[PDB]
Design a protein around this ligand. Sequence first.
Ligand SMILES: O=C(Nc1ncc(Br)s1)NS(=O)(=O)c1ccc(Cl)c(Cl)c1
Ligand SMILES: O=C(Nc1ncc(Br)s1)NS(=O)(=O)c1ccc(Cl)c(Cl)c1
Ligand SMILES: O=C(Nc1ncc(Br)s1)NS(=O)(=O)c1ccc(Cl)c(Cl)c1
Ligand SMILES: O=C(Nc1ncc(Br)s1)NS(=O)(=O)c1ccc(Cl)c(Cl)c1
Lengths: 319, 317, 317, 317
Amino acid sequence: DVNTLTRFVMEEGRKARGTGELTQLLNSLCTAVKAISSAVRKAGIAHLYGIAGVKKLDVLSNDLVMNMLKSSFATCVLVSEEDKHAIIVEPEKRGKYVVCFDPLDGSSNIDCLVSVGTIFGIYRKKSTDEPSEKDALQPGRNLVAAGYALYGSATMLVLAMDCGVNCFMLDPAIGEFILVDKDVKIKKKGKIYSLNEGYAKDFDPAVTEYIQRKKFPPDNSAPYGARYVGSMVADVHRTLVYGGIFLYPANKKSPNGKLRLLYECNPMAYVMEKAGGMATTGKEAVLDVIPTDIHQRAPVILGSPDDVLEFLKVYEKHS
Amino acid sequence: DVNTLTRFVMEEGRKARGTGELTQLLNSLCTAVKAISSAVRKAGIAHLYGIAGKLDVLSNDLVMNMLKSSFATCVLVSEEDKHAIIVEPEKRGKYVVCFDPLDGSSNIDCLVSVGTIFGIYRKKSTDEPSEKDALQPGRNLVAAGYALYGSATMLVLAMDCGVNCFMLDPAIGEFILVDKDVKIKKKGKIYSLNEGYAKDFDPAVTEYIQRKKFPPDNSAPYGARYVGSMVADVHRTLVYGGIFLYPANKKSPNGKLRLLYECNPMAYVMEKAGGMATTGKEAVLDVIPTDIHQRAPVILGSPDDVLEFLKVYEKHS
Amino acid sequence: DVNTLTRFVMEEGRKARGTGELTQLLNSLCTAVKAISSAVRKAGIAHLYGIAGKLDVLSNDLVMNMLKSSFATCVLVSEEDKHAIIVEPEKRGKYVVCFDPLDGSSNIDCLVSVGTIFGIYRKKSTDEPSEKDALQPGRNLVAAGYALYGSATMLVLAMDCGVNCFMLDPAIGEFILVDKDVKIKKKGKIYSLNEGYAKDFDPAVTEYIQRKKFPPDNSAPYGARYVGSMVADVHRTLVYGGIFLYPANKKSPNGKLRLLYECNPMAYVMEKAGGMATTGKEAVLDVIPTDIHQRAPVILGSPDDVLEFLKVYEKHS
Amino acid sequence: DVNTLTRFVMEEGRKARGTGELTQLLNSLCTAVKAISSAVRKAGIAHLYGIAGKLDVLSNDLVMNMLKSSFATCVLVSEEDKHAIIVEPEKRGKYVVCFDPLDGSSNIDCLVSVGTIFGIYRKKSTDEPSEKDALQPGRNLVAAGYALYGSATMLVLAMDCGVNCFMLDPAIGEFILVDKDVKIKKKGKIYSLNEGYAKDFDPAVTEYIQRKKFPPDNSAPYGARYVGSMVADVHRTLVYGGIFLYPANKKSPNGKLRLLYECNPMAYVMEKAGGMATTGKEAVLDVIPTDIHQRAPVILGSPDDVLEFLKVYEKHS
Ligand SMILES: O=C(Nc1ncc(Br)s1)NS(=O)(=O)c1ccc(Cl)c(Cl)c1
Ligand SMILES: O=C(Nc1ncc(Br)s1)NS(=O)(=O)c1ccc(Cl)c(Cl)c1
Ligand SMILES: O=C(Nc1ncc(Br)s1)NS(=O)(=O)c1ccc(Cl)c(Cl)c1
Ligand SMILES: O=C(Nc1ncc(Br)s1)NS(=O)(=O)c1ccc(Cl)c(Cl)c1
């Protein structure tokens, strides 16, 4: 039987006999993802170029997500990569959910038409205070749901909840997300590692050794492949689909890494673990970090559990 | 003034006072690319999944059929077909086309960028057309380019008049001219190759890559990018500058990429954009192929970066 | 604040604190409409014509499969199916749906407007589900409406809360609420019927139309419009006011339009929009059907115009 | 073999060994039609309704701008513009175009069909371009046609080689040839006009229409259809046969429809398909216009039916 995102989420929401607020939010997010996809694919660009005789894509992506989440009545604190402060939903539109999102991740590299994406994490508001920015400072362990949209050769939405990970393919002819991969699980061990090796000069010594182990294996077995798109959603999704390891690790020049904990690292870690994978900073599980700043950075190394462990053994070797 | 791919090609063709045969070819290819783009973005996927109760084969069928029926071609070489296709007599025109209809399609399960690559030659003689007609060096290219099915769909067309970039507007099914007469940066800050094969590197590649990470003049190291789809990597090299390497090694002394419909059309685009493309030993466009599926090592991109690679290569003789 | 069909139905469903089964039904129906609209606009037609080397049956299969798989229905009546369809036990829900999946599709070769019409009943009896379940009078409707595949695709949904109009934005595949709680004009200036049957008209219809061309009060005559596709004619009537008539004639002594899936859903939308719908003898919504494909004469539209016709009807006993 | 409008026009242009200027025009027109179609189907409407926080004017702009930038035109006459538009010298070409960019847009609120009508003349003299270049009789048309934005979008193109119909595939933005060299039925079964204004009918129309409803023999009366949008009614007349009338009366002795960009292009299409088009006194294509916006009565369609109307018309003269 064919399944769409909206049918799937209404079905699970009825099994769980919830109020519907989470379902309303995901549906609002889904509309936003389709609007972003259409704009990323440059629909209507002919009008920018005078066919009949105007806002940047990440600004528009941010406006779309913000506006669709606010008007769902299901949220109260919204944190975006684009906004310094948490947005507090106005009283008449407030619901019980906190959302952290990157509206168009990888948009620095969009001039070359590389893959871009939207990342999101959804927390229940855990306190009875008046809603504030503090409500977004929960660890990834507390996520009710997370996922990402990938605007690649086709548009795919990956949704992770406590019942597992499911992949939906956008059918642009009818504007519906069709469930194509049910209950997804990552390979125990992959054959690809992914990181920016152009910065090897600054590598932590463990990262240098681990990558040396991938290119020059001690038992003279076959080397791993290298891939690095430079867009997290693209790189993380390839890890999920083919197995392997993705690294944006810490170094002495960037002791906490570069990616953001709330709206990049935590949702990707959540998808990974729900698929049977691992995600570490090296010192701790990504999801166990209690953030003190909504825009704080976190190092991340994720992928197949065996590949992340081998990096950890090398990491332990260098203390 | 707004410009479309079709309008642009008819204007240049009228300037040259040609017969229209190349214009008819390019328009058919333009149509094929739009069909491939629609399928690649998964239009109609709901019907595959039972809403009412392969992709590179379809891409090849799309390109094959639009070219055959364009009446401008006589020999078609595709990555998908071991032998050249000889167009049937009523449909023959004077052009040879070499193409990869969906380059990068092994890794489309992760939705990575894919693309179509093409190079167009003229028929080599008035005899009955044969596969030999596709064995010309890249220097003979009349036109070449690629479509990139990325976050958006873009067509890059390289002709003697230069390189122009068209963005597919999906709302109207038209290629809008967005980058006229495009030129690559003289020097970039990005290198692109699969470093997982570092065990097999030629010493010049080992040395050249070492200089990118540990610059002798204390400048900032290059960033690394490798999508693993040539069209994506080459297009990024064109747009941002840098260098793309798929070089020869001890296990593949002639490389991995195919010369006719991957290396040569990209080499032509690169040179037409002010960049360079070498095998290390010679310019790619100067290699005379003997087999339609022969491989070639390739190092392409910004001229200062390719020249710098060639100095290291000559250092190791 | 922007509103979509899915968002609207969920907001209304949670106000009512229902289980969601109706919302699941409507969402499945909306998806079928989007896919039907894509087929009507001929997306993918190029592949039928060999770019790589029936519409009402497809429309029926889309509505059938989406309703069956919604788990919300138990009896399905379609213009395309001789018998009611009984949903298999594991997929049964509490609703009966009667629909014309592609109304006007005989006259579609001229690209006339086409549409989907639907009416939704709660199953009223506790017997094992059967054809009898769809034989309820229109008064019992839970929801009804239509999709018009015209110059744009619009979905009209009438419920107890009134009539709402959603515009399909094809760029994102979403139904946008554009007309909230719509009410028809009290009196219009257009009449709509096939005047080619003037030879078979009953005296009251003959007289009513004569009054439209020759008003006794020297006011302006009404304009006439007749597309020949019920969704198009009724929707213009809803949007601009006026009157639509398909009375009985010698080829159709019980009228021509179908009671279950044409007259009742339109009568429901009209009355929820402040309009009227009569057979001449009784309200359409008060007709108790005995046969699922049975016909009814229909006169509907703005209330002043329908009353004016009814006054003429009583004049002739 | 699959055929597109662009491919078709290039093949026809090479048979005739023309310069390409007309082909550049039609291709520019085809692009404008696709953009118009996208807007009529309401793509991006979500943004108007605040998802992130003009239609006949846009149609006129799209056609004006695509014609100007084709380098194929010198005088442009539009229903939207009081005066003929003179293309600037540097963009001048040899053709005069008269068009209605969005005919029927008065009733577009009911989502009824709308359309673009166009007629293409060669400039006949070397004088400075002025309105006079647009005052040719329809006999001089080089090409004419219309786009119907209906249940699907179809482009009808009439030239000396006949009438051909192209279906827009929206998935790829391509007009697919679906009906080659079409001819209207010798006689139809449909009459089309606004019978609401029968009070003001010319007595000859009164008798003609009365004969369609009450045949003197035992044949079947005609059915009536009147969409109220000329492209829709005319296109149905083309596909199914019959007669479309927008005739003169004492209140409108020259009719209502405009001669240059409504009556003439349809007359040309009709005659190229084996149909007829008269004002009652003469063929529409024989009128020598004196004003770019002058009106002309039109009765067009199957030849047996127009001849029969002309018989009744002379009876009252
Ligand atoms: O949506 C609902 N209930 C509903 N009742 C009727 C309809 Br129709 S939907 N509850 S929910 O709390 O939003 C929820 C709970 C679990 C999951 Cl897994 C998801 Cl996705 C959503
Ligand atoms: O197309 C033409 N002639 C034409 N005449 C009228 C029209 Br309309 S097009 N010639 S051609 O050989 O195909 C050619 C030549 C140069 C370039 Cl640059 C390109 Cl693209 C194509
Ligand atoms: O849908 C629901 N409940 C829901 N709970 C959570 C969500 Br999310 S929806 N109930 S219903 O019976 O289907 C109904 C009732 C009234 C109307 Cl007006 C409509 Cl449309 C539908
Ligand atoms: O287009 C051309 N020539 C061309 N040369 C190369 C190409 Br490619 S097209 N000539 S034309 O005057 O525009 C013309 C003539 C007859 C028809 Cl029937 C049409 Cl459509 C158009």
